[PDB]
Amino acid sequence: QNPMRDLKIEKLVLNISVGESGDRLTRASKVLEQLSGQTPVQSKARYTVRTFGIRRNEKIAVHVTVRGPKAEEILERGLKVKEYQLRDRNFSATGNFGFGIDEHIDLGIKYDPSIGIFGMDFYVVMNRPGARVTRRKRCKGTVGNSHKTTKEDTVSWFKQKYDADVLDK
Amino acid sequence: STLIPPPSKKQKKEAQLPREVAIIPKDLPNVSIKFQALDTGDNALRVPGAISEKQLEELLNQLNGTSVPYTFSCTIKASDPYSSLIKPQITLLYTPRAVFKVKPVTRSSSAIAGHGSTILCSAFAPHTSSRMVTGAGDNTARIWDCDTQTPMHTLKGHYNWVLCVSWSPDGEVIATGSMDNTIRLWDPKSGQCLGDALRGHSKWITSLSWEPIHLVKPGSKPRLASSSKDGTIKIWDTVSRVCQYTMSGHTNSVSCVKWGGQGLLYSGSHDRTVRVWDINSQGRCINILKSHAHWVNHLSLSTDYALRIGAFDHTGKKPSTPEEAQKKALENYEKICKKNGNSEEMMVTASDDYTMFLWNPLKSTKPIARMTGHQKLVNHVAFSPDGRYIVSASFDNSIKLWDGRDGKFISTFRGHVASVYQVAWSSDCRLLVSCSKDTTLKVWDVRTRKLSVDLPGHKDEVYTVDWSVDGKRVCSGGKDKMVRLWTH
């Protein structure tokens, strides 16, 4: 049965990791800003690596989370770029999914030669109503088995609205 | 913090012994008892065994045939109320209460901000303790909703300070005296200008007193009386908005005015002179009282608490018609008035000669008694509601209690550090609030003659106080801008 345990999107999370910090970092930030309206967040490096040329607490990467209609627009707009064709992987066992594009111009958006090119990480995390149980402060709980999002149920959902193709074995 | 110093090695071993108990041995010795009223009558000899003071009511009430409970005293050397008999025949002194208990005012509600200046005056409504008006050194007055601790109509009109305010005893009209030249009558509910402002006095307004209800005809509004620094007094009619008769006996400024019991204005003035002023003569003087070596500040009457409230007793349960309001106004008056079955209103004055003279103006233009005691000037005087104790505020940081009937000294309240500006009573005639040049207000237990509770709160000088008639609530106002309300 399903009335109302449907399959809404929790959130889209766009992400750009940068090898270096400086102009090229704050410009990647600026891309996520004007695309989201929201100010993005700068993750720091967790330890020093050396073969990547990075140090503990360097500021290495920006990202932004987007929820509700604006999420679905940028989803589909990027989803276009990927030919409406993902893979049999791409979907997690717990019923989320993601993809990338390279070149941030292939989905609206002009170029500007004083900004350069980046690409993006798209990641789409799914739920039903009552996911709040595992997220609110008061009466905090864990969601029961036959309410959990799965790979089967999300792929079926994807194959339907959007109309897109799965690919691979 | 300088301490109360510690108990000594012997004084511990005093305390460590078991002792005393309350006991009451039995107690049945047959000691003779006389009964006496503080008014006049002696009533003649019983001789029972010893009993609790609750029972000596029930012995009296069947004898006189009332059901009125009664307060008791004995040994008048001493003056102090088995509880007597441990101190050693007994002349028992009985006296009526008006049965009640107004509570000790302890806690603040948090400080109500508003107008951005010092607060000059602050009067409760008579009929309810929710409604309370304040006059500031900002040109606005403001009426506060006191249950919710918030402004009920921020009120505008004047173009200088507002020095005194008063609520009419029927409770229809508020009046606001000003540092310019004007009086503005207000409705509480609308908060709007009732016609044009009352203009007539040439300099600023000093105090405002209402014509009380039991004189005024049932289905006519009470007239206002207004004293001013030019020295005249005018009598304002609220409906027509025009003065009937200016009255111009005093040469210097009039410090305050009061409307009396029997159609008689009293006006305490800066020409060292107190003018008893009949209304029926249409602006005319009858008697001119002279004692003081300095000017006269303030003028208290025995009836003034009853005349201020006018019909609305502590419940605030309203009169259904003006003909009822006549009788309710007359009955609250005639609780206090007939003390020996005769309308003997006492008048009392303060002045900078450090002295209060006691007056009975209908009987004699001489004074009765000279209350002399204070070092620096007395400022406020107050009768207690029942006309029984007088108390007066002074600039030597101390408040002196004087018996009302004979102007005889009782005691002094000590506690205040800096100069005391004004005082007010609890309606039951037990507690007594006072305000100072320092932060603190204090409340004074009159029965034990002692400090009940100090209450700090304000950041600066505190000019005005008043106690609500029911006796939940006490207001305050002063130099730090914030109106604090105080409660149990």
Binding site: - | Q16, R19, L451
Partner: protein, 182 residues
């Protein structure tokens, strides 16, 4: 309704710990475990002692303050708390008395040449250029100017001072241990 309670023997009290010691003679077969009417006798016996304990306590003196509204560690005006005595009853203490009195070598010497120990005002020494005050030990020390500042005059000069501080810090933390021992 009757409050006062006679006994044969007087009761010996302890109003510090709040206790009433009763030496009056008990019956066996009242308090024997076979008895049906056992407990009401213990209630009847105790109620007397508790009444006698209270009838002392209410006849004590009591504090009655005039302070009110946030008496920040004390009582309101219209409480009225009862002034108890100390315990007569001698407990044993939890731990032995805190008296590990050594002299510690300095203070021996500071007796023999006194050296009245000092007025001890506060941290902040005065700097001249800068105009402002600035301590000393605390923050931006008159200790650590030489490390931060920019030229020295007359092998490095700064790290010699970073050594020669830590010698004196070692020396104090060493000179503890002998006085900790002895």
């Amino acid at each position: 309704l009757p409050v006062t309670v006679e006994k044969p023997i007087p009761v010996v009290y302890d109003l510090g710990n709040l206790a009433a010691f009763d030496s009056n003679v008990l019956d066996k077969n009242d308090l024997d475990s076979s008895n049906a009417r056992r407990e009401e006798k213990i209630k009847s016996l105790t109620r007397d002692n508790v009444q006698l304990l209270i009838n002392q306590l209410l006849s004590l003196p009591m504090k009655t303050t005039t302070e009110s509204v946030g008496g920040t560690g004390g009582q309101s005006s219209v409480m009225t708390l009862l002034q108890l005595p100390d315990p007569t009853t001698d407990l044993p203490r939890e731990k032995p008395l805190p008296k590990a009195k050594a002299m510690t070598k300095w203070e021996k010497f500071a007796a023999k040449k006194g050296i009245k120990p000092k007025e001890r005002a506060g941290k902040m020494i005065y700097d001249e250029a800068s105009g402002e005050w600035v301590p000393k030990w605390g923050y931006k020390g008159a200790n650590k100017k030489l490390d931060d500042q920019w030229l020295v005059e007359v092998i490095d000069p700064r790290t010699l001072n970073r050594a020669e501080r830590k010698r004196l810090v070692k020396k104090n933390e060493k000179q503890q241990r002998r006085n900790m021992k002895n």
